[PDB]
Ligand binder design. Structure first.
Ligand SMILES: CC(C)=CCC[N@H+](C)[C@H]1CC=C(C)CC1
Ligand SMILES: CC(C)=CCC[N@H+](C)[C@H]1CC=C(C)CC1
Ligand SMILES: [Mg+2]
Ligand SMILES: [Mg+2]
Ligand SMILES: [Mg+2]
Ligand SMILES: [Mg+2]
Lengths: 354, 354
């Protein structure tokens, strides 16, 4: 491509939103804010601890911005979990996001990974040291099966970040590479399994549905991002190994053909997602529907994805899509547009400096 | 039908061995046997230890049969790894095969999985106790990156077996379930990464190729089995939740449509497998080609897959398939057909009983 497929983007987006049934919720801005600040505050105090401040090498400003981007995603998507749950999930997912930062080679620190694990000795890699130490606060909200899923997916993620360091889009013809990588660093099963706290659900009772949820949520969650994230990533010459971009390199297809591959999967996933869970345990479909809608809300609201920019362009345009989009956007805006000043405070740096 | 597409089976298989370039090797029967007995002997002595004999609850006969099925698969596929390597890999993969047996619910034993792991306390589940204890002998043949892969994939496998106990083929319409499950219990990355001992390869030097190998081998390895295993697996009352069978249940398609899907993926995988690695480091393509051919050899040779039965019903036909099928089957049973009496002895029970 040359310029952004604005309209095509609009169409697909609108379609995605319809398929999932993007409608208003009883999750008020007062509530969103209540939770945002709760989660943010617990996390902030956590990342402000000296030990964390030391072992986690991250630019203060990025830790701040990342923590905020995470708390938002969690609060807006795990709408049904408890406040403490959102908090602890926020701390975990902030750790994972921060790891994408380290340029440092894992090799030397991963050499005795298994021996130290089995021995109970703190890991050599500082990230694992902090993360595995904190993990119990996340795992306490879940049952054994879901916990196993969170554990695995996180391990998966670590490897993903490692592979990512090589900035490799796959050898041309290596068709299986792209999705292999996307799943590797997508945290699919972590997200999927983290949607079912043992306080509101029963793994054994809903094993089949939970397992199915994980299986399906994994792809929906990553593809919806790759999709809605396509606008911010379009011109970012720094971001060179994204799913779509790798489809191009590995499958040797046009950036458009690749974008098409994505949209198709995204939609199909959405459809089947609804098809499967609609007539299932109401409490399930609920958590599932809330996550999907919240996930889309957050994407549309976080400046990280600069979607507000495509809002202006098609704002006054009088076509169908352009309008259906703006309506949806405006929808989310009313519940999701919240000035950080209302919840994200004080800054992590400040709590730390004390 | 409740019959068996014997024709498509033969055709697909040929196309398969053709794509992979199924040709003779310099891996003589004397050599195969030398390795078979080496691996078997080390493993046998291992599984005959009192601790192992206790914690691993398996019917002696099955442990015996399984151990033999594993040693064979390894020796015939990891043709380039050292003898000790094949041995240790045999011990690990025998553990994984045996786990498919336990009908026991993992839940209660997995409740403190993470806390015991981080603390260095032996796992509650006896399998993990034995497997994690032994793991170092497997991991010593690899570098940190490949080790991580073996570790993850094995964890993945454990979950797979858990999900398997529910004998669930997926909710109709849950299109992403099948492959999710297949990969979960396929040991894809374990196999893929175990092909590169640090004694013959350099993870850092061949990171890109090794990573790509894992990414591609994962699907080829599982699909080729699902394919060649489509025999002994169908006329069953046990593992009724196979990949193909689940495609049917989840994608709501005919057993034939499902079978064609597999064969399409299997071939394509094969095609690209060759396309990608041919012009790559010769030593790589070599390990890769040997694994593929050996993997097919072993399937054709192990009783477990009863492929000898389709040999007879075609050992005398005209089609360029039933004939071009035995042309290989023959070769297979030439360097691969080996009476257990020549290597698998004494029996594990015997060493144990002493
Ligand atoms: C970057 C964010 C928050 C979301 C985009 C989705 N990603 C596929 C994953 C990236 C790492 C995390 C923490 C969660 C999910
Ligand atoms: C089952 C066997 C031995 C070979 C075919 C491939 N499997 C599907 C894999 C999963 C289970 C193991 C133990 C090994 C590899
Ligand atoms: Mg993206
Ligand atoms: Mg990114
Ligand atoms: Mg099979
Ligand atoms: Mg099986």
């Amino acid at each position: 491509m040359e310029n952004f497929p604005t309209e095509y983007f609009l169409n697909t987006t609108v379609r995605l939103l319809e398929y999932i049934r993007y409608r208003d919720s009883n999750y008020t801005r007062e509530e969103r804010i209540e939770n945002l600040h709760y989660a943010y505050n617990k996390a902030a105090h956590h990342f402000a601890q000296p030990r964390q401040q030391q072992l986690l090498k991250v630019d203060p400003k990025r830790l701040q911005a990342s923590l905020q981007t995470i708390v938002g995603m969690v609060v807006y998507s795990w709408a049904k979990v408890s406040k403490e749950c959102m908090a602890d999930l926020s701390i975990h997912y902030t750790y994972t996001l921060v790891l994408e930062d380290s340029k440092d080679d894992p090799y030397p620190t991963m050499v005795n990974y298994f021996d130290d694990l089995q021995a109970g000795r703190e890991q050599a890699h500082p990230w694992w040291a902090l993360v595995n130490e904190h993990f119990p606060n996340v795992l306490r909200h879940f049952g054994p099966f879901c916990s196993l899923n969170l554990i695995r997916s996180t391990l998966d993620f670590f490897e993903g970040c490692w592979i990512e360091q090589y900035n490799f889009g796959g050898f041309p013809g290596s068709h299986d590479y792209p999705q292999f990588l996307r799943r590797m660093n997508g945290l699919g099963h972590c997200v999927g399994a983290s949607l079912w706290p043992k306080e509101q659900f029963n793994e054994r009772s809903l094993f089949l549905e939970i397992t199915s949820a994980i299986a399906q949520m994994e792809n929906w969650m990553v593809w919806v991002n790759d999709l809605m994230s396509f606008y911010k990533e379009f011109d970012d010459e720094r971001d060179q190994i994204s799913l779509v971009k790798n489809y191009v390199v590995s499958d040797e297809i046009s950036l458009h053909e690749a974008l098409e591959k994505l949209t198709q999967d995204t939609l199909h996933s959405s459809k089947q997602m609804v098809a499967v869970f609609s007539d299932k345990d109401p409490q399930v479909m609920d958590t599932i529907e809330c996550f999907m809608h919240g996930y889309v809300t957050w994407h549309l609201c976080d400046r990280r994805y600069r979607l507000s920019e495509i809002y202006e362009k098609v704002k006054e345009e009088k076509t169908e899509d352009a309008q259906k989009f703006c309506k949806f956007y405006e929808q989310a805006a009313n519940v999701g547009a919240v000035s950080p000043s209302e919840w994200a405070y004080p800054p992590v740096a400040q709590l730390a400096n004390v």
